[PDB]
Design a protein around this ligand. Sequence first.
Ligand SMILES: N[C@@H](Cc1c[nH]c2ccccc12)C(=O)O
Length: 420
Amino acid sequence: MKTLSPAVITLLWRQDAAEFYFSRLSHLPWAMLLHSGYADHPYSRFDIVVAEPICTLTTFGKETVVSESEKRTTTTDDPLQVLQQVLDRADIRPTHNEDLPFQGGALGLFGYDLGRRFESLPEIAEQDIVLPDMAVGIYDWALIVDHQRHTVSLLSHNDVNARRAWLESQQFSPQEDFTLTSDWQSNMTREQYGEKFRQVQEYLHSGDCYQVNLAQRFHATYSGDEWQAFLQLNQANRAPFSAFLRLEQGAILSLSPERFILCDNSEIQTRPIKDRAENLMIVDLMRNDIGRVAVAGSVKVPELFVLVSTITAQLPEQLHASDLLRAAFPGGSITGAPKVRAMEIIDELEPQRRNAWCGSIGYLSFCGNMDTSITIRTLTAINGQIFCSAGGGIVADSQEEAEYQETFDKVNRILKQLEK
Ligand SMILES: N[C@@H](Cc1c[nH]c2ccccc12)C(=O)O
């Protein structure tokens, strides 16, 4: 077991380093950027850039294709377990390093439809987006941008000098300006929306769920360099869990502000914090998922009123982060409660499958840690089609019109930014 820490070179500091080094990689497949949106907090301290994976994992439904150089392997095993074996087999296990949250390992997309490999449910919505349910690369190196130290760190478990020379020889190519070429069109009318909304309230009325996240999807055509859309969105939104993923099948543009699950040195955290008969029950939609994997008695939640995170806990020594991800996937807070029941209703009412939206983007570092986002406020750019979805958690007392409108308000800024 190679526990050596990775070799590191520091690069000069610049307040735009991550876009500066990733600009010239954004058209390479498996080039990926996690950007903290220039946001000012502890959980928006780093930018991470990776490219040129030594190994990739592509899951499409039941199959996962593991590809490494000339070798290519297909398997129907649990894709997270398959991920875990690939990681394990690298035999690279350096000590945690708070200045290097990711020290090579896996990084990529966990799309929402990947939860069907862990949760059984009908499939009624249509698959009109062909983009993997898991698109993840194994990287033996990374570029780390640290906003608290003002440092730029290039690291590698292989020859960090040769990785540097490679990265500094990439040339800045010119890029076709980005442009929307059509108006945004919802996959549902107000009225259709109103119907699905009423259908979710029938279920709630019947006691079949307590909450369902129902979303609609906006679609437009575009031309030009998706990196360019991303620079402009990132600017405007400054979301701490943003990401730009260049996949073989399209580009994922995430302006997510929300963490999914942090696992740092076995400590788990979810979202950063920001005689009587009690009639109210307050449920954290991720509590049961975390509690199924956390160390018994380790879960802590803050005192609520009607810890730096809503849920804090401990990972058992015998589990991996990948196990933790499995158990929580897809996120309780963007599906509803009971989760799987809610997933089923969601799939009944949403004309199309969510694919990347509301899945998770993140990394499983070789040191064991993990950080992941929930991909809300995330666009999918493919074939000159770009998509952006928006949902709202419906509960018993929600109101139809207000909820419709809430869906627009969640993303109107992103859409209108791409207009004008
Ligand atoms: N914001 C995280 C890094 C990050 C940016 N975008 C992400 C997307 C997914 C996971 C992590 C990230 C941090 O400071 O550590």
